[PDB]
């Protein structure tokens, strides 16, 4: 049960300074170093630097020396990365990963999306996409959740607190002409068990501290 | 620093066939005494990267034997024979000897697959959104191949333009298909002033376009 739990996605003003955390569990903390990666859709993956916590010894990519500061709390088994003056180029997904000497990146964190923006944060509105005669074909019905008008990315969607993953399509969000994002998450289920099963989408928007659970029920007409 | 060059940066392969990704390091990446620390990772859309290869030719625990790493000096190669939909994503090579460690640009593995027609469904706006003043009608095109599909909205048979957005999923990791979600956004007034709402789909798997309609005064 080795686990690296990273902090929630952020919206930060240009020139601000944000602190990401990566809490390790299920192994002996001081036996490994924590390395940090940056992922962007244009560049790709970049190694930022590393800290060996037992000691506190850090080393940085020259691209990120000065901006990114790695520290380590040995009690809480946590590693911190600080960005001291955010820029438009700092919007990315930041990863932590564990490593022992002469090893590899075997366990990765879940990633922290940082959006650097001057715009306002808005939580999403969640609407049901109800199964009906117009969404049934061949004994299967489709249903979902419309996650409308949020900023920034990302929104995560689970179904039944993660217990429903088969036949789930959470779509890439689209940019609306207002500058806010919109997203849809659908799932195909048996039509015969629509009366006995419950389908709840769990929508999570960390930048606005929004958590919405929506029970999607069939509506005939 | 040492530059890692992946090629191709996107790699189409038919199902069950072979695929090879070439990764070349600008300098030597042999560690002073032990082998070059050349690692291969795979990432899916919305997931952390996963380790497949370390120490150019060592499969990581649990990785199918269909993945094989090789190379010497500065030339490295990943080989996936019998590619399945579970192998989709971006493969990154990576050197871990000389600071700062570097990755290749990534290589997108994409399945070729038999033709599959889309399942078309339509969802009228919910009353909860209707009370907000807006009305989004959602058309879903589920599990089709290939990715190219045409979606046209029709309100009272009048073809629509400039009021809809659509997105396609990443390729499905179990059946190599794509899904498409298109949303037509009207106001509550505009929605309530028209009655029949239709989503029309053109795709290779269909002999003729498919309309999925509903009437606002339902059933």
């Amino acid at each position: 049960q080795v686990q690296l739990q990273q902090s929630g996605a952020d919206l930060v003003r240009p020139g601000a300074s944000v602190t990401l955390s990566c809490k390790a569990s299920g192994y002996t903390f001081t036996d490994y170093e924590m390395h940090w990666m940056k992922q962007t859709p244009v560049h790709g993956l970049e190694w930022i630097g590393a800290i060996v916590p037992e000691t506190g010894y850090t080393a940085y990519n020259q691209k990120f020396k000065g901006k990114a500061i790695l520290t380590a709390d040995k009690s809480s088994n946590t590693v911190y990365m600080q960005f001291r003056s955010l820029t438009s180029e700092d919007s990315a997904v930041y990863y932590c990963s564990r490593l022992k000497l002469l090893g590899y990146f075997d366990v990765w964190g879940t990633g922290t999306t940082v959006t650097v923006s001057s715009a306002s944060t808005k939580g999403p509105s969640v609407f049901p996409l109800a199964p009906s005669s117009k969404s049934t074909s061949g004994g299967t019905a489709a249903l979902g959740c419309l996650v409308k008008d949020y900023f920034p990315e990302p929104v995560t969607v689970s179904w039944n607190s993660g217990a429903l993953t088969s036949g789930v399509h959470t779509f890439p969000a689209v940019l609306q002409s207002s500058g806010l994002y919109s997203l849809s998450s659908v799932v195909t289920v048996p039509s015969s068990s629509l009366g006995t099963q419950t389908y709840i989408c769990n929508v999570n928007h960390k930048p606005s501290n929004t958590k919405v659970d929506k029970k999607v029920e069939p509506k005939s007409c | 620093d040492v530059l890692m060059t992946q090629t191709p940066l996107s790699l189409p392969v038919s199902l069950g066939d072979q695929a090879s990704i070439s990764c070349k390091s600008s300098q030597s990446i042999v560690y002073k005494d032990g082998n070059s620390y050349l690692e291969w990772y795979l990432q899916k859309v919305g997931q952390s990267p996963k380790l497949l290869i370390y120490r150019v030719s060592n499969r990581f625990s649990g990785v199918p034997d269909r993945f094989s790493g090789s190379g010497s000096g500065t030339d490295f190669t990943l080989k996936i024979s019998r590619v399945e939909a579970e192998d989709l994503g971006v493969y990154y090579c990576f050197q871990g000897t000389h600071l700062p460690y570097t990755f290749g640009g990534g290589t997108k593995l994409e399945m070729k697959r038999t033709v599959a027609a889309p399942s078309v469904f339509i969802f009228p706006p919910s009353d909860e959104q209707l009370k907000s003043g807006t009305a989004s009608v959602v058309c879903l095109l589920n599990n089709f191949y290939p990715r190219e599909a045409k979606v046209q909205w029709k309100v009272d048979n009048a073809l629509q333009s400039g009021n809809s957005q659509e997105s396609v999923t990443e390729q499905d990791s179990k059946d190599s298909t794509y899904s498409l979600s298109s949303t037509l956004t009207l106001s509550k007034a505009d929605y309530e002033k028209h009655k029949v709402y239709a989503c029309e789909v053109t795709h290779q798997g269909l002999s003729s376009p498919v309309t999925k309609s509903f009437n606002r005064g339902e059933c």
Partner: peptide, 8 residues
């Protein structure tokens, strides 16, 4: 990765 430390 080779690592960055001497131990741990």
């Amino acid at each position: 990765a080779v690592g960055i430390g001497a131990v741990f």
